[PDB]
């Protein structure tokens, strides 16, 4: 037995989002819904077709029809960005079945320009004969960003690793980038910089081996 869902649902802030779940004449069984936000376990959000567990906002409601079961979220908040999964039990084979899941994204949130923080190697790490520059980019939206590193205003590509952006508790985005270097390389240039490009504009931070 199979449970189908749309792969994604887009919705504007405050609008209503609807996530639908079709299965083998579901309507004969009972549908349950789970919310899973990035990096967390599922939480039950609706059970028994339309019941709200203690602690879930009223704006979460569950409905059903003939071949489709629906989860509705009124007044959608950026905080409701999540993957949602319907679920039923198959009483003949005695098997639990999940839908494939629906990723809900609320688009048209306010633009936020990034803050960039750049940490130089710690003396502790330099004393272990290593060196890592750490560029943390926070409080930005939308999510797309590019990072470039420079030593004395010349580009660096070796030794760079950068994470794809992820939501913070704010619902704004954050990302990180590392430049790995030997202690010698760190001390051999006058400065290093991390430049972030977001929505056509850039923010650059600079660190120097000679400032503490």
């Amino acid at each position: 037995y199979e449970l189908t869902q749309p792969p994604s649902v887009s919705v504007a802030p405050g609008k209503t989002a609807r996530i639908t779940c079709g299965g083998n004449n579901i309507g004969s069984k009972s549908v349950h819904w789970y919310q899973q936000k990035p990096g967390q376990a599922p939480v039950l959000v609706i059970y028994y077709d339309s019941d709200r567990p203690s602690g879930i906002p009223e704006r979460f409601s569950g409905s059903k029809s003939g071949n489709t079961a629906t989860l509705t979220i009124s007044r959608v908040e950026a905080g409701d960005e999540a993957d949602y999964y319907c679920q039923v039990w198959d009483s003949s084979r005695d098997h639990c079945v999940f839908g494939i899941g629906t990723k809900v994204t609320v688009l048209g949130q306010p633009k936020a320009n990034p803050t960039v923080t750049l940490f130089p190697p710690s003396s502790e790490e330099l004393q272990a004969n290593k060196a890592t520059l750490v560029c943390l980019i926070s409080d930005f939206y939308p999510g797309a960003v590019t990072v470039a590193w420079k030593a004395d205003s010349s580009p660096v590509k070796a030794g760079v690793e950068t994470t794809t952006p992820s939501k913070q508790s704010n619902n704004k985005y954050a990302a990180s980038s590392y430049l790995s270097l030997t202690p010698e390389q760190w001390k051999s240039h006058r400065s290093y910089s991390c430049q972030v490009t977001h929505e056509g504009s850039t923010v650059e931070k600079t660190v120097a081996p000679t400032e503490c």
């Binding site: 376990a41 039950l44 098997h95 639990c96 899941g101 803050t115 940490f119 992820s166 913070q168 400032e211």
Partner: protein, 227 residues
Amino acid sequence: QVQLQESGPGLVKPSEALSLTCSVSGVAISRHYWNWIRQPPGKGLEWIGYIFFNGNTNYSPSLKSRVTISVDTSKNEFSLTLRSVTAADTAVYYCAREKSVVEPDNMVRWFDPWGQGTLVTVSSASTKGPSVFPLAPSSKSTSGGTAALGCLVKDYFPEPVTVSWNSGALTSGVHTFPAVLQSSGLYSLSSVVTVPSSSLGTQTYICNVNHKPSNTKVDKRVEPKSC
């Protein structure tokens, strides 16, 4: 309240057996059916099976041949064994409490609550615990009223590491970034917190790094940098 907590090995070599345990608080095992679910990274939820303390079990068709679920009432625990793992078995494994109502001729069964999940990585590579370094606040990581400070967590395997600050007492302003996978096959990540710049001379900041795959915990003091 009812809490569930999975514990696992972190890393499992191909063809060997995965063993997990779920410890239950706040209710007796004998009062419910208990389930295991899993989720491959990037993918969906897949039920594994259930158990009841009198011996009843049913397992997923795909996994029936390789799965054993068991129960230990004397420790209020249930467990999962999955033999002969391959890379397809790398996943977050969740335990969950089954809730059920008796409706005629049918089954209404759902899960409330779930545990936190534990990542199992199937790999021939060896475990490696992290090295942790401070990201010290300085006159250049400040933005007026606040300063950012952090911990760099380097060169560990497998995922995941989790980080708390001041033993969980400090939650406001915390962000732990996803890991990078380096060319060496090792992961690194950073956790940062923003705090009053006023506080830096008179408040202690400690990052608590946990790498359960290596049974390692590191509590690293992060102090203002003094040149």
